Every structure is written in C-alpha cells, then in structure tokens.
Design a protein around this ligand. Structure first.
Ligand code: NA
Length: 262
DNA sequence: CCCCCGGGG
DNA sequence: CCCCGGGGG
C-alpha cells in the first residue's frame, strides 16, 4: 500500500515520472527509495513511536519485524537515529556490505549500533555479491586443494553444467564443514559472527517489490538467515552444494567471476 | 573496465 | 540452475 510515507518517497524519487521502459533507472531509484524508507521510519524516537502504531499498519509491520529480528522491545528504547553508510573504504573482500545503520539508545545510556544491508527485488532470491574464488577461500578458510579447485571450476565454467554427477556430490561433501562460514562470509564479509560492527551488516532487509509497488518485507538477523539457508541447502536437492545460496556468474567483468544469489 | 544492483526462462 | 543487462565510478 502506498501509505502516506511511501507516497511521499515515491514522489520525492520521481518514480511515476519514469517511463516504464527505463528499467535500469527504476531499479536504482527504487533501491535508494527503500533504503530511505527504513531511515525515515527510524529517523528519531518521535518517528518510531509514531510508526509502530495501528495508525500505520504497514510501517508498524516493518518496524516490528526489525525490532523482532533484534529481540528488542519498543518500550526499552529511549532514543533512535539512523543514517546512510558511506565509509569510502574497502576491507578484505571489498567494500563493506553495510548500506545504513540504526543506533538505539537504552535507559542506562548504553546503546546498540545496527548495521544494515537493504535490497529490493521482485523475487525471493536476488544477487548478494560477486567474488573471485581466491577471495572466497581466503575469507572462509579454504586452502589449496580439491575443494578450492572444484569451486574454481564452477567459476571458470560459469555454472556447474560441466561437473559430473560425482563431482557435484563431491563439492557438496567437501564444503559441508564450511557451510555456515561460507554463507556468513558471503553476506557479511566475515566468516565468524559479528555484532554492532559497522563493517559487517547485522540484519538483512529484503523488500519484495513487484511492478514498482511494495508487497512485503522480510528482515532477518544473520544467525537466522544462515539457519534458513542451511535448512534449504540440506534438502534432497542440496541447493548451492548445501549452502542454500544460488551459485552463478558475474557478467560485469572480463575475468571469470562468481556471483551468489540469496 | 570493474563492481553493485537487478532479472528471464 | 543457467544465461545475462543497466549504470555509476
Ligand atoms: Na546506502
């Protein structure tokens, strides 16, 4: 529903003035728009108290899902602020995956910083990142060997179409011990758990947007996202070689490079 | 040219 | 899963 707030944002971003054939600009605009949607809902304590009410059913659903993923009670929040994240630096694996942050201040003056990764998509799965095999292995803790080479084969072929049924089962088998680290590193750039560190997102916010309009939102903390992917990857088909991520290729550069959707 | 944000069938 | 595109820096 184009609520009062969303109606305002769609107007500020000139969405309705964009020809329908301008898909590229539309996607880019919608992306920035939905990041801003979160920033405004959590702009200040006044906004948060306002939106977490039955007077704004949609923003209440969004704000409640965010607090729920953090196991935080609205009544314990004394102050809130938010902002776009632009550090202008890179770390092991590239630019940090943090799109924005929300800081909550509690009664005893303590606070919690919540780095966020925000995306919009018409699908359940969307590109989360692209990396070279060596970068992944370095971040996940995989050394030279059969595992690294099978991953490299996937990168070079740009799919698993040339793997023999055996090789596919073999990759899945060797990756099993690294499943969690692989997933966590792919979406946060850190293999081990992180919390409140601006360089690594703590929550993954996914807005489902179809035909330019809001449909729903899903907000998961990293632990839950990993559990979900692990469960998905454990099924008979062993999606993503057990990782639950969809392995494919990045078309952006000359070099063979991997892309992961999740 | 590379990287990030996306999608079709 | 496999095959790909728009656009900014
Ligand atoms: Na941002």
């Amino acid at each position: 529903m184009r609520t009062e707030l969303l109606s305002k944002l769609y107007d500020d971003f000139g969405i309705d003035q964009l020809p329908h054939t301008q898909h590229g600009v539309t996607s880019d605009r919608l992306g920035k728009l939905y990041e801003k949607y979160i920033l405004d809902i959590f702009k200040d304590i006044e906004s948060l108290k306002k939106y977490n009410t039955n007077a704004f059913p949609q923003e209440k659903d969004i704000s409640s899902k965010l607090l729920k993923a953090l196991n935080l009670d609205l009544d314990n929040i004394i102050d809130v602020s938010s902002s776009d994240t632009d550090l202008g630096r890179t770390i092991a694996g590239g630019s940090p995956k943090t799109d924005a942050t929300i800081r909550f201040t509690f009664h005893n003056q303590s606070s919690r910083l919540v780095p966020l990764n925000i995306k919009h998509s018409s699908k359940k799965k969307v590109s989360i990142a692209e990396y070279d095999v060596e970068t992944i292995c370095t971040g996940v803790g995989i050394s030279d060997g059969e595992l690294k080479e099978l991953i490299r084969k996937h990168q070079n072929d740009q799919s698993a179409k040339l793997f023999t049924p055996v090789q596919k089962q073999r990759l899945t088998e060797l990756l099993e011990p690294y499943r969690e680290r692989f997933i966590r590193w792919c979406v946060t750039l850190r293999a081990e758990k992180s919390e409140g560190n601006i360089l690594h997102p703590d929550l993954l916010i996914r807005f489902q947007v179809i035909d330019r309009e809001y449909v729903d939102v899903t907000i998961k903390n990293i632990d839950d996202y990993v559990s979900d992917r692990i469960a998905e990857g454990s099924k008979a088909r062993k999606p993503g070689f057990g990782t639950g991520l969809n392995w494919t290729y990045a078309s952006g550069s000359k070099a063979k490079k991997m892309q992961f959707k999740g």
